[PDB]
């Protein structure tokens, strides 16, 4: 039907108030819908796109689970499901958005909660229900370059798109050429992997693959997918040995692994982007910076680096062993078969 | 009977010599129970120090032990039941005082003992003896800054202290004031928790608890106590707490954990303690000091930093998997109720 067409709508222009009208579309928000900061505004706003639209998007009021702990991410923040506290916030909205029956009613719980929650943790939510929900099958969900360019883009073409948009009319519009080879000069000979590293392509395929292969998810059954272990196994042990393929062609050794977390690390990397979305800019890393221990209270991370060491001393420990020990304190074999997995 | 209120005049004057009269009262000390250096003049003594006594208590020779361990540790060393050497010692000294089983042979064994093994060690060694032998129970033993101030007082009173008995008769004599917030200035924020790190109660407390609950004597036996486990878990844990309290009093934030033993430790101190029975005085630990490798031959220490690294690593493991193993092989659960136990 529409519905599934509509909700493509929300990928459009991700910190644009929802009520603003996406392509030749526009939302017939409720007055009550409208975000504390915008409601005692309603009349004047939801009449001065309301002309100037093709179609208009009814959305019924319903209900609305508390959104509470989706709403604790601040909008201005970053993501990362990296991060304990975000798996949590994320994995709860999933759980929602997933947990409305009806394709209506999904479209009238992401309509409200759509601006006010962080866009990144929106964008992944959604992107998750639809991809494993059986109402919104084969739906083409928009690239996320597309929706979120300031993580695959300098930071430096974002004031020239501005100024060009603004100045030049449609149809005269330059394109905007994206540097490459930007982020190191030829001093770092780590610089000649730009093609790779930075590659649009390469880190899409990254992003979409931990889409479909979660490794955390409420309801085991979307994280339990044949062999995924094994797939982590191998898809990151072939990027590895194609990267050291190409350090080949650029006359560098195999990557030196990270042997011991003590030791400082060489190799420092500025990657010069910018989130529009925290408005702020990604830090860097200098050159021999030292892991050091994480004690982020906000972020509910409090790990030492031997924490890290220990699981490390474990896990070889049962490699070598040839067994590893459950819960319950049963052995498991690691086998030929299900041994990698 | 007597024989109770005879033994606390034992803790009188630690380092003056049995033979010089505690109190009101005198021993009537055999003279195969005067000290090597002083038997050879004995008889000149008892008569010097005979004078301004009221009673004298007489006391029977008995057989007595070896008291060889107990004599191993110097006069003038200090006594510590954390030394390995020293538990060997003490436990040896407490089965001697614990083994004599009546109330006089204890009284005899005691004079004889007194000056010639080191202070410290005799009042613990008594200590423990008295508050767990059935004759001896329920005595109220003399608070042990009493006897040994030298422990729990800024050295420089003690010259002060000289002065004031020598020159000033009696009865005229001022209080000494003991300094407090002494050990470090402004400069040091750490020196704000004085009147918590250094109070006189508190350290008492410290002391006692150690005392009705030691980890090492003979058999279970005054060790095996219920839940002592528990009870050194909790009470540790209540100084933790109430401390991080006084920071936050002090404008300060929550104490840091000792991560890891090869990084620097910030905060030095200086005690400013000087002990009179070895005459010397504490040393004090420099800003930024490292843990080092122990190698203390006449205490009986060879341990590495490494050894205590292994004890943390197997113990973090043992408390994740959820059991421990005996001696044996043998697994045993840290269920809820006895695994902290
Ligand atoms: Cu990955
Ligand atoms: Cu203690």
Redesign the interface.
Known sequence: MNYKKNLLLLYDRPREPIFMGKGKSVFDVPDNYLTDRYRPIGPEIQNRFGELAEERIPVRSIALPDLRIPMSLGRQEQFSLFIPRHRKIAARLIDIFMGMRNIEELQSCAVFARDRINPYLFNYALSVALLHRRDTKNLDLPSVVEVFPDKYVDSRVFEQIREEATVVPEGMRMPIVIPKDFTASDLDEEHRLWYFREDIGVNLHHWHWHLVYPFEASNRAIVDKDRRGELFYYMHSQLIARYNFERFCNRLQRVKRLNNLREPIAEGYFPKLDSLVASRTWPGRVDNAVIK?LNRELDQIKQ???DLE?WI??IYEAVHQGYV?D?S?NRIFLDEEKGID
């Open positions: 221990d030492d680096v031997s220990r001393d474990r020990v819960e304190g």
